[PDB]
Amino acid sequence: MNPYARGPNPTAASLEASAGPFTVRSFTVSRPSGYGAGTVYYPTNAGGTVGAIAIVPGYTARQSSIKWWGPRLASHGFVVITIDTNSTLDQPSSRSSQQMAALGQVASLNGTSSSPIYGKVDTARMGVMGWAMGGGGSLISAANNPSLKAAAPQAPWDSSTNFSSVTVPTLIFACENDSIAPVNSSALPIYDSMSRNAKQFLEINGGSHSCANSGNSNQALIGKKGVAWMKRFMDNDTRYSTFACENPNSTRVSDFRTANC
Ligand SMILES: O=[N+]([O-])c1ccc(O)cc1
């Protein structure tokens, strides 16, 4: 009787696949509200309203770096907006404001009859993702908006690592050999600061700073985990509890931690 459960029962194979069960379409945002540019990905056949996820790139970067998440997540039953920031050189606090503005605009479009996502979104169920400074921005978003249902930043950085205010379920993807935002001074301290949430830390063996970006060679695992985390926590969908919470016990993972999951 979970009103938010969508799609067939998951399997490892179905979550590792390039595409989930639903057909995906996309469109460009005509007039971004409070951010630079956006692409919205959505399922055409999810069978009920779905939650929305906003995804932000890192410093200097654009939608291309994070775009693979759009179809991957949308095909499992989410509306996903990938953004460009107002400036490629925006810092994490500005990136958080823009991420939240993008979620607001998804809500606007859900109420706009000419939009392809008209009536497709449950605006009460939202999540945040992003790379590097965009990952820091996602954590700021979560700290400031505790009704967000999930966060899953990748290779995050912020000038502070104290995210003890975050009560939103948070999965941190990290990249072992990150030279930009080293794990030991960025992703791991951030993970360790969070005391009141379901949380997880998944470090990719040998990964550079771009190890969770479009074109990575761990899309099966990373995509399984991101989808599972969003499903479990955005949809309250306990079919995904093991996928969300498990240690993959994988040679592709150099460090795994989880708590309250
Ligand atoms: O953009 N970032 O991910 C950064 C920026 C500066 C820094 O010293 C470390 C990481």
PDB file of C-alpha atoms and ligand atoms in Angstrom:
ATOM      1  CA  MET A   1       0.000   0.000   0.000  1.00  0.00           C
ATOM      2  CA  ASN A   2       2.971   2.320  -0.589  1.00  0.00           C
ATOM      3  CA  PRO A   3       1.452   4.935  -2.845  1.00  0.00           C
ATOM      4  CA  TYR A   4       4.877   5.879  -4.189  1.00  0.00           C
ATOM      5  CA  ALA A   5       6.081   2.462  -5.346  1.00  0.00           C
ATOM      6  CA  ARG A   6       6.634   2.341  -9.101  1.00  0.00           C
ATOM      7  CA  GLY A   7       7.870  -0.297 -11.519  1.00  0.00           C
ATOM      8  CA  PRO A   8       8.645  -3.992 -11.326  1.00  0.00           C
ATOM      9  CA  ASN A   9      10.453  -5.610  -8.458  1.00  0.00           C
ATOM     10  CA  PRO A  10      14.157  -4.779  -8.755  1.00  0.00           C
ATOM     11  CA  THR A  11      16.984  -7.235  -9.295  1.00  0.00           C
ATOM     12  CA  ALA A  12      20.720  -6.683  -9.335  1.00  0.00           C
ATOM     13  CA  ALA A  13      20.626  -7.180 -13.107  1.00  0.00           C
ATOM     14  CA  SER A  14      17.781  -4.735 -13.650  1.00  0.00           C
ATOM     15  CA  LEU A  15      19.532  -2.051 -11.580  1.00  0.00           C
ATOM     16  CA  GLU A  16      22.940  -2.649 -13.221  1.00  0.00           C
ATOM     17  CA  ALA A  17      21.481  -2.358 -16.734  1.00  0.00           C
ATOM     18  CA  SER A  18      21.935   0.856 -18.680  1.00  0.00           C
ATOM     19  CA  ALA A  19      18.199   1.504 -18.655  1.00  0.00           C
ATOM     20  CA  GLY A  20      15.376   0.891 -16.251  1.00  0.00           C
ATOM     21  CA  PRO A  21      11.819  -0.123 -17.097  1.00  0.00           C
ATOM     22  CA  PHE A  22      10.394   3.207 -18.239  1.00  0.00           C
ATOM     23  CA  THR A  23      10.751   5.056 -21.516  1.00  0.00           C
ATOM     24  CA  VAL A  24      12.505   8.409 -21.226  1.00  0.00           C
ATOM     25  CA  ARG A  25      12.040  11.673 -23.086  1.00  0.00           C
ATOM     26  CA  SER A  26      13.696  15.031 -22.503  1.00  0.00           C
ATOM     27  CA  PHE A  27      13.386  18.731 -23.253  1.00  0.00           C
ATOM     28  CA  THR A  28      15.359  21.957 -22.792  1.00  0.00           C
ATOM     29  CA  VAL A  29      14.066  24.566 -20.328  1.00  0.00           C
ATOM     30  CA  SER A  30      13.118  27.718 -22.265  1.00  0.00           C
ATOM     31  CA  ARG A  31      13.509  30.283 -19.510  1.00  0.00           C
ATOM     32  CA  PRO A  32      15.448  28.948 -16.534  1.00  0.00           C
ATOM     33  CA  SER A  33      14.271  30.407 -13.224  1.00  0.00           C
ATOM     34  CA  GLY A  34      17.352  31.242 -11.186  1.00  0.00           C
ATOM     35  CA  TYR A  35      19.979  29.159 -12.995  1.00  0.00           C
ATOM     36  CA  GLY A  36      21.784  29.053 -16.326  1.00  0.00           C
ATOM     37  CA  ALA A  37      20.252  26.276 -18.431  1.00  0.00           C
ATOM     38  CA  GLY A  38      18.517  22.960 -17.896  1.00  0.00           C
ATOM     39  CA  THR A  39      17.488  19.690 -19.421  1.00  0.00           C
ATOM     40  CA  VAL A  40      14.533  17.790 -17.996  1.00  0.00           C
ATOM     41  CA  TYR A  41      14.382  13.986 -18.339  1.00  0.00           C
ATOM     42  CA  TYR A  42      11.133  12.207 -17.554  1.00  0.00           C
ATOM     43  CA  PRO A  43       9.440   8.826 -17.830  1.00  0.00           C
ATOM     44  CA  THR A  44       6.581   8.595 -20.307  1.00  0.00           C
ATOM     45  CA  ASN A  45       5.018   5.510 -18.686  1.00  0.00           C
ATOM     46  CA  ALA A  46       5.725   5.484 -14.902  1.00  0.00           C
ATOM     47  CA  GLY A  47       2.090   4.882 -13.978  1.00  0.00           C
ATOM     48  CA  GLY A  48       1.876   7.429 -11.190  1.00  0.00           C
ATOM     49  CA  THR A  49       3.461  10.705 -10.196  1.00  0.00           C
ATOM     50  CA  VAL A  50       7.176  10.560  -9.424  1.00  0.00           C
ATOM     51  CA  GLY A  51       9.684  12.527  -7.426  1.00  0.00           C
ATOM     52  CA  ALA A  52      12.103  15.080  -8.853  1.00  0.00           C
ATOM     53  CA  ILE A  53      15.890  15.218  -8.660  1.00  0.00           C
ATOM     54  CA  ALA A  54      18.107  18.224  -9.513  1.00  0.00           C
ATOM     55  CA  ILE A  55      21.726  17.620 -10.492  1.00  0.00           C
ATOM     56  CA  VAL A  56      24.507  20.238 -10.600  1.00  0.00           C
ATOM     57  CA  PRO A  57      28.005  20.063 -12.176  1.00  0.00           C
ATOM     58  CA  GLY A  58      31.313  21.048 -10.624  1.00  0.00           C
ATOM     59  CA  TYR A  59      33.507  24.118 -11.031  1.00  0.00           C
ATOM     60  CA  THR A  60      34.063  24.921 -14.757  1.00  0.00           C
ATOM     61  CA  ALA A  61      31.786  22.066 -15.765  1.00  0.00           C
ATOM     62  CA  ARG A  62      28.527  21.740 -17.633  1.00  0.00           C
ATOM     63  CA  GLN A  63      25.597  19.399 -17.964  1.00  0.00           C
ATOM     64  CA  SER A  64      27.669  16.952 -20.018  1.00  0.00           C
ATOM     65  CA  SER A  65      29.649  15.900 -16.921  1.00  0.00           C
ATOM     66  CA  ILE A  66      26.516  14.730 -15.114  1.00  0.00           C
ATOM     67  CA  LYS A  67      24.060  14.046 -17.953  1.00  0.00           C
ATOM     68  CA  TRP A  68      24.249  10.252 -17.839  1.00  0.00           C
ATOM     69  CA  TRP A  69      22.234  10.379 -14.589  1.00  0.00           C
ATOM     70  CA  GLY A  70      19.255  11.923 -16.417  1.00  0.00           C
ATOM     71  CA  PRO A  71      18.183   8.917 -18.439  1.00  0.00           C
ATOM     72  CA  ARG A  72      19.504   6.460 -15.881  1.00  0.00           C
ATOM     73  CA  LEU A  73      17.368   7.817 -13.065  1.00  0.00           C
ATOM     74  CA  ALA A  74      14.378   8.860 -15.179  1.00  0.00           C
ATOM     75  CA  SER A  75      14.100   5.340 -16.631  1.00  0.00           C
ATOM     76  CA  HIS A  76      13.458   4.071 -13.087  1.00  0.00           C
ATOM     77  CA  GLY A  77      10.725   6.609 -12.332  1.00  0.00           C
ATOM     78  CA  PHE A  78      11.980  10.126 -11.570  1.00  0.00           C
ATOM     79  CA  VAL A  79      11.854  13.523 -13.195  1.00  0.00           C
ATOM     80  CA  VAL A  80      15.483  14.679 -13.391  1.00  0.00           C
ATOM     81  CA  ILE A  81      16.730  18.164 -14.165  1.00  0.00           C
ATOM     82  CA  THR A  82      20.389  18.618 -15.041  1.00  0.00           C
ATOM     83  CA  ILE A  83      21.527  22.233 -14.879  1.00  0.00           C
ATOM     84  CA  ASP A  84      24.176  24.600 -16.038  1.00  0.00           C
ATOM     85  CA  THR A  85      24.921  27.252 -13.463  1.00  0.00           C
ATOM     86  CA  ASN A  86      24.635  30.976 -14.109  1.00  0.00           C
ATOM     87  CA  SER A  87      28.450  31.024 -14.211  1.00  0.00           C
ATOM     88  CA  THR A  88      30.746  28.035 -14.576  1.00  0.00           C
ATOM     89  CA  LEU A  89      32.692  29.630 -11.716  1.00  0.00           C
ATOM     90  CA  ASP A  90      29.870  29.738  -9.158  1.00  0.00           C
ATOM     91  CA  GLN A  91      30.783  28.466  -5.686  1.00  0.00           C
ATOM     92  CA  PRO A  92      28.872  25.788  -3.675  1.00  0.00           C
ATOM     93  CA  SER A  93      26.374  28.131  -1.906  1.00  0.00           C
ATOM     94  CA  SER A  94      25.266  29.680  -5.230  1.00  0.00           C
ATOM     95  CA  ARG A  95      25.087  26.176  -6.776  1.00  0.00           C
ATOM     96  CA  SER A  96      22.764  25.098  -3.940  1.00  0.00           C
ATOM     97  CA  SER A  97      20.479  28.121  -4.522  1.00  0.00           C
ATOM     98  CA  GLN A  98      20.395  27.324  -8.250  1.00  0.00           C
ATOM     99  CA  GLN A  99      19.723  23.606  -7.577  1.00  0.00           C
ATOM    100  CA  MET A 100      16.753  24.521  -5.411  1.00  0.00           C
ATOM    101  CA  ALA A 101      15.514  27.030  -7.995  1.00  0.00           C
ATOM    102  CA  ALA A 102      15.631  24.222 -10.563  1.00  0.00           C
ATOM    103  CA  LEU A 103      13.493  22.046  -8.293  1.00  0.00           C
ATOM    104  CA  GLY A 104      11.100  24.969  -7.935  1.00  0.00           C
ATOM    105  CA  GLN A 105      10.888  25.228 -11.720  1.00  0.00           C
ATOM    106  CA  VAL A 106      10.171  21.496 -11.999  1.00  0.00           C
ATOM    107  CA  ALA A 107       7.268  22.197  -9.658  1.00  0.00           C
ATOM    108  CA  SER A 108       6.200  25.097 -11.890  1.00  0.00           C
ATOM    109  CA  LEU A 109       6.329  22.890 -14.997  1.00  0.00           C
ATOM    110  CA  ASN A 110       4.300  20.175 -13.241  1.00  0.00           C
ATOM    111  CA  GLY A 111       1.571  22.889 -13.032  1.00  0.00           C
ATOM    112  CA  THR A 112       2.020  24.182 -16.653  1.00  0.00           C
ATOM    113  CA  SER A 113      -0.352  22.562 -19.126  1.00  0.00           C
ATOM    114  CA  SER A 114       1.959  22.982 -22.105  1.00  0.00           C
ATOM    115  CA  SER A 115       4.813  21.123 -20.383  1.00  0.00           C
ATOM    116  CA  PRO A 116       5.661  17.505 -21.114  1.00  0.00           C
ATOM    117  CA  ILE A 117       5.810  16.936 -17.281  1.00  0.00           C
ATOM    118  CA  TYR A 118       2.390  18.472 -16.561  1.00  0.00           C
ATOM    119  CA  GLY A 119       0.918  16.460 -13.660  1.00  0.00           C
ATOM    120  CA  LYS A 120       3.820  13.969 -13.666  1.00  0.00           C
ATOM    121  CA  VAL A 121       5.582  15.170 -10.494  1.00  0.00           C
ATOM    122  CA  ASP A 122       4.919  14.704  -6.796  1.00  0.00           C
ATOM    123  CA  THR A 123       6.359  18.006  -5.667  1.00  0.00           C
ATOM    124  CA  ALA A 124       6.528  16.777  -2.080  1.00  0.00           C
ATOM    125  CA  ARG A 125       9.263  14.242  -2.945  1.00  0.00           C
ATOM    126  CA  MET A 126      12.551  15.712  -4.124  1.00  0.00           C
ATOM    127  CA  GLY A 127      16.246  14.866  -4.151  1.00  0.00           C
ATOM    128  CA  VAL A 128      19.605  16.452  -4.872  1.00  0.00           C
ATOM    129  CA  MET A 129      22.763  15.264  -6.628  1.00  0.00           C
ATOM    130  CA  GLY A 130      25.865  16.866  -8.070  1.00  0.00           C
ATOM    131  CA  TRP A 131      29.587  16.719  -8.685  1.00  0.00           C
ATOM    132  CA  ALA A 132      32.372  18.345  -6.667  1.00  0.00           C
ATOM    133  CA  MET A 133      31.290  21.929  -5.843  1.00  0.00           C
ATOM    134  CA  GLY A 134      27.856  20.772  -7.091  1.00  0.00           C
ATOM    135  CA  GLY A 135      28.102  17.971  -4.562  1.00  0.00           C
ATOM    136  CA  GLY A 136      28.899  20.469  -1.853  1.00  0.00           C
ATOM    137  CA  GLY A 137      25.939  22.429  -3.108  1.00  0.00           C
ATOM    138  CA  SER A 138      23.743  19.360  -2.777  1.00  0.00           C
ATOM    139  CA  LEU A 139      24.784  18.954   0.857  1.00  0.00           C
ATOM    140  CA  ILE A 140      24.053  22.625   1.507  1.00  0.00           C
ATOM    141  CA  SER A 141      20.656  22.118  -0.137  1.00  0.00           C
ATOM    142  CA  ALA A 142      19.980  19.169   2.142  1.00  0.00           C
ATOM    143  CA  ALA A 143      21.119  21.058   5.245  1.00  0.00           C
ATOM    144  CA  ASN A 144      18.881  24.020   4.450  1.00  0.00           C
ATOM    145  CA  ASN A 145      15.877  21.968   3.244  1.00  0.00           C
ATOM    146  CA  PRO A 146      15.473  18.929   5.479  1.00  0.00           C
ATOM    147  CA  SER A 147      12.236  17.897   3.754  1.00  0.00           C
ATOM    148  CA  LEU A 148      14.341  16.777   0.794  1.00  0.00           C
ATOM    149  CA  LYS A 149      14.022  13.006   0.711  1.00  0.00           C
ATOM    150  CA  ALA A 150      17.494  12.001  -0.511  1.00  0.00           C
ATOM    151  CA  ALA A 151      20.917  13.314  -1.478  1.00  0.00           C
ATOM    152  CA  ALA A 152      23.594  11.516  -3.503  1.00  0.00           C
ATOM    153  CA  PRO A 153      26.541  13.826  -4.282  1.00  0.00           C
ATOM    154  CA  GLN A 154      29.689  12.637  -6.020  1.00  0.00           C
ATOM    155  CA  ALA A 155      33.275  13.609  -5.223  1.00  0.00           C
ATOM    156  CA  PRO A 156      31.889  16.427  -3.085  1.00  0.00           C
ATOM    157  CA  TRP A 157      33.763  19.483  -1.954  1.00  0.00           C
ATOM    158  CA  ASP A 158      32.872  22.506   0.142  1.00  0.00           C
ATOM    159  CA  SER A 159      35.152  24.890   2.104  1.00  0.00           C
ATOM    160  CA  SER A 160      33.540  23.404   5.241  1.00  0.00           C
ATOM    161  CA  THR A 161      33.275  19.683   5.864  1.00  0.00           C
ATOM    162  CA  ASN A 162      30.817  20.035   8.779  1.00  0.00           C
ATOM    163  CA  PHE A 163      27.474  18.772   7.527  1.00  0.00           C
ATOM    164  CA  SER A 164      26.171  17.716  10.935  1.00  0.00           C
ATOM    165  CA  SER A 165      22.970  19.641  10.075  1.00  0.00           C
ATOM    166  CA  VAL A 166      22.078  17.156   7.330  1.00  0.00           C
ATOM    167  CA  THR A 167      19.245  14.867   8.351  1.00  0.00           C
ATOM    168  CA  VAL A 168      18.394  13.830   4.773  1.00  0.00           C
ATOM    169  CA  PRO A 169      19.447  10.288   3.724  1.00  0.00           C
ATOM    170  CA  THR A 170      22.797  10.874   2.024  1.00  0.00           C
ATOM    171  CA  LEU A 171      24.933   8.630  -0.182  1.00  0.00           C
ATOM    172  CA  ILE A 172      28.387   9.988  -0.918  1.00  0.00           C
ATOM    173  CA  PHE A 173      30.177   8.700  -3.954  1.00  0.00           C
ATOM    174  CA  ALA A 174      33.919   9.237  -3.651  1.00  0.00           C
ATOM    175  CA  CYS A 175      36.857   8.624  -5.960  1.00  0.00           C
ATOM    176  CA  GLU A 176      39.900   6.945  -4.402  1.00  0.00           C
ATOM    177  CA  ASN A 177      42.601   8.850  -6.219  1.00  0.00           C
ATOM    178  CA  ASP A 178      40.822  12.213  -6.388  1.00  0.00           C
ATOM    179  CA  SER A 179      43.481  14.936  -6.692  1.00  0.00           C
ATOM    180  CA  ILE A 180      41.032  17.866  -6.740  1.00  0.00           C
ATOM    181  CA  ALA A 181      38.931  17.062  -3.656  1.00  0.00           C
ATOM    182  CA  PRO A 182      40.977  14.394  -1.895  1.00  0.00           C
ATOM    183  CA  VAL A 183      38.825  11.902  -0.061  1.00  0.00           C
ATOM    184  CA  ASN A 184      40.683  12.263   3.216  1.00  0.00           C
ATOM    185  CA  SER A 185      40.090  16.025   3.408  1.00  0.00           C
ATOM    186  CA  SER A 186      36.723  16.318   1.633  1.00  0.00           C
ATOM    187  CA  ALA A 187      34.336  13.373   1.058  1.00  0.00           C
ATOM    188  CA  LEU A 188      35.265  11.318   4.131  1.00  0.00           C
ATOM    189  CA  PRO A 189      35.206  14.164   6.712  1.00  0.00           C
ATOM    190  CA  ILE A 190      31.870  15.222   5.193  1.00  0.00           C
ATOM    191  CA  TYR A 191      30.556  11.663   5.642  1.00  0.00           C
ATOM    192  CA  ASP A 192      31.845  11.478   9.182  1.00  0.00           C
ATOM    193  CA  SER A 193      30.153  14.758  10.176  1.00  0.00           C
ATOM    194  CA  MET A 194      26.630  13.491   9.552  1.00  0.00           C
ATOM    195  CA  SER A 195      25.197  11.944  12.716  1.00  0.00           C
ATOM    196  CA  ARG A 196      21.392  12.107  12.357  1.00  0.00           C
ATOM    197  CA  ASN A 197      20.774  10.419   9.031  1.00  0.00           C
ATOM    198  CA  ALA A 198      20.824   7.274   6.996  1.00  0.00           C
ATOM    199  CA  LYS A 199      24.133   7.641   5.212  1.00  0.00           C
ATOM    200  CA  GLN A 200      26.558   5.787   2.998  1.00  0.00           C
ATOM    201  CA  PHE A 201      30.087   6.242   1.640  1.00  0.00           C
ATOM    202  CA  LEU A 202      31.146   4.447  -1.533  1.00  0.00           C
ATOM    203  CA  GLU A 203      34.691   5.058  -2.788  1.00  0.00           C
ATOM    204  CA  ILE A 204      35.541   3.855  -6.282  1.00  0.00           C
ATOM    205  CA  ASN A 205      38.867   1.980  -6.464  1.00  0.00           C
ATOM    206  CA  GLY A 206      41.400   3.896  -8.551  1.00  0.00           C
ATOM    207  CA  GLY A 207      38.949   6.646  -9.433  1.00  0.00           C
ATOM    208  CA  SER A 208      39.990  10.116 -10.480  1.00  0.00           C
ATOM    209  CA  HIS A 209      37.882  13.137  -9.551  1.00  0.00           C
ATOM    210  CA  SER A 210      35.614  12.379 -12.531  1.00  0.00           C
ATOM    211  CA  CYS A 211      34.934   8.750 -11.532  1.00  0.00           C
ATOM    212  CA  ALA A 212      31.141   9.145 -11.291  1.00  0.00           C
ATOM    213  CA  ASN A 213      30.750  11.386 -14.359  1.00  0.00           C
ATOM    214  CA  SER A 214      29.319  10.672 -17.796  1.00  0.00           C
ATOM    215  CA  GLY A 215      31.557   8.153 -19.495  1.00  0.00           C
ATOM    216  CA  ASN A 216      32.721   6.408 -16.323  1.00  0.00           C
ATOM    217  CA  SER A 217      33.428   2.659 -16.478  1.00  0.00           C
ATOM    218  CA  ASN A 218      31.447   1.825 -13.325  1.00  0.00           C
ATOM    219  CA  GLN A 219      27.968   2.710 -14.510  1.00  0.00           C
ATOM    220  CA  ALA A 220      26.565  -0.649 -13.470  1.00  0.00           C
ATOM    221  CA  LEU A 221      27.528  -0.233  -9.806  1.00  0.00           C
ATOM    222  CA  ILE A 222      27.273   3.540  -9.503  1.00  0.00           C
ATOM    223  CA  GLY A 223      23.944   3.612 -11.323  1.00  0.00           C
ATOM    224  CA  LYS A 224      22.578   0.702  -9.269  1.00  0.00           C
ATOM    225  CA  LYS A 225      23.517   2.490  -6.067  1.00  0.00           C
ATOM    226  CA  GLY A 226      22.205   5.909  -7.076  1.00  0.00           C
ATOM    227  CA  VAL A 227      18.903   4.511  -8.284  1.00  0.00           C
ATOM    228  CA  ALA A 228      18.536   2.254  -5.264  1.00  0.00           C
ATOM    229  CA  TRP A 229      19.226   5.088  -2.821  1.00  0.00           C
ATOM    230  CA  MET A 230      16.748   7.403  -4.555  1.00  0.00           C
ATOM    231  CA  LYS A 231      14.105   4.678  -4.754  1.00  0.00           C
ATOM    232  CA  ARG A 232      14.471   3.669  -1.126  1.00  0.00           C
ATOM    233  CA  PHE A 233      14.387   7.158   0.261  1.00  0.00           C
ATOM    234  CA  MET A 234      12.398   9.266  -2.244  1.00  0.00           C
ATOM    235  CA  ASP A 235       9.734   6.590  -2.731  1.00  0.00           C
ATOM    236  CA  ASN A 236       9.941   4.991   0.755  1.00  0.00           C
ATOM    237  CA  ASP A 237      10.289   1.843  -1.314  1.00  0.00           C
ATOM    238  CA  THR A 238      11.595  -0.909   0.922  1.00  0.00           C
ATOM    239  CA  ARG A 239      11.953  -3.244  -2.051  1.00  0.00           C
ATOM    240  CA  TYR A 240      15.191  -1.301  -2.428  1.00  0.00           C
ATOM    241  CA  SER A 241      16.432  -1.495   1.151  1.00  0.00           C
ATOM    242  CA  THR A 242      19.049  -4.165   0.552  1.00  0.00           C
ATOM    243  CA  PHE A 243      20.296  -2.598  -2.686  1.00  0.00           C
ATOM    244  CA  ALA A 244      20.476   0.784  -0.970  1.00  0.00           C
ATOM    245  CA  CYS A 245      22.084  -0.363   2.261  1.00  0.00           C
ATOM    246  CA  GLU A 246      24.340  -3.273   1.275  1.00  0.00           C
ATOM    247  CA  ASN A 247      28.086  -3.308   1.061  1.00  0.00           C
ATOM    248  CA  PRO A 248      28.588  -4.381  -2.600  1.00  0.00           C
ATOM    249  CA  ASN A 249      31.671  -6.343  -1.462  1.00  0.00           C
ATOM    250  CA  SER A 250      33.205  -5.354  -4.741  1.00  0.00           C
ATOM    251  CA  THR A 251      36.733  -5.097  -6.105  1.00  0.00           C
ATOM    252  CA  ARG A 252      35.608  -1.820  -7.741  1.00  0.00           C
ATOM    253  CA  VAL A 253      35.065  -0.312  -4.209  1.00  0.00           C
ATOM    254  CA  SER A 254      38.136   0.647  -2.205  1.00  0.00           C
ATOM    255  CA  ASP A 255      36.168   1.948   0.827  1.00  0.00           C
ATOM    256  CA  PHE A 256      32.582   1.347   1.913  1.00  0.00           C
ATOM    257  CA  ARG A 257      30.794   2.716   5.004  1.00  0.00           C
ATOM    258  CA  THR A 258      27.150   2.964   5.966  1.00  0.00           C
ATOM    259  CA  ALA A 259      25.099   3.887   9.038  1.00  0.00           C
ATOM    260  CA  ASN A 260      21.462   3.945  10.065  1.00  0.00           C
ATOM    261  CA  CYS A 261      20.563   2.078   6.851  1.00  0.00           C
TER     262      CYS A 261
HETATM  263  O1  LIG B   1      36.162  22.594  -6.975  1.00  0.00           O
HETATM  264  N1  LIG B   1      36.595  21.822  -6.026  1.00  0.00           N
HETATM  265  O2  LIG B   1      36.199  20.545  -5.991  1.00  0.00           O
HETATM  266  C1  LIG B   1      37.708  22.180  -5.318  1.00  0.00           C
HETATM  267  C2  LIG B   1      38.147  23.482  -5.346  1.00  0.00           C
HETATM  268  C3  LIG B   1      39.241  23.857  -4.590  1.00  0.00           C
HETATM  269  C4  LIG B   1      39.939  22.919  -3.845  1.00  0.00           C
HETATM  270  O3  LIG B   1      41.052  23.317  -3.148  1.00  0.00           O
HETATM  271  C5  LIG B   1      39.496  21.614  -3.781  1.00  0.00           C
HETATM  272  C6  LIG B   1      38.383  21.242  -4.547  1.00  0.00           C
END
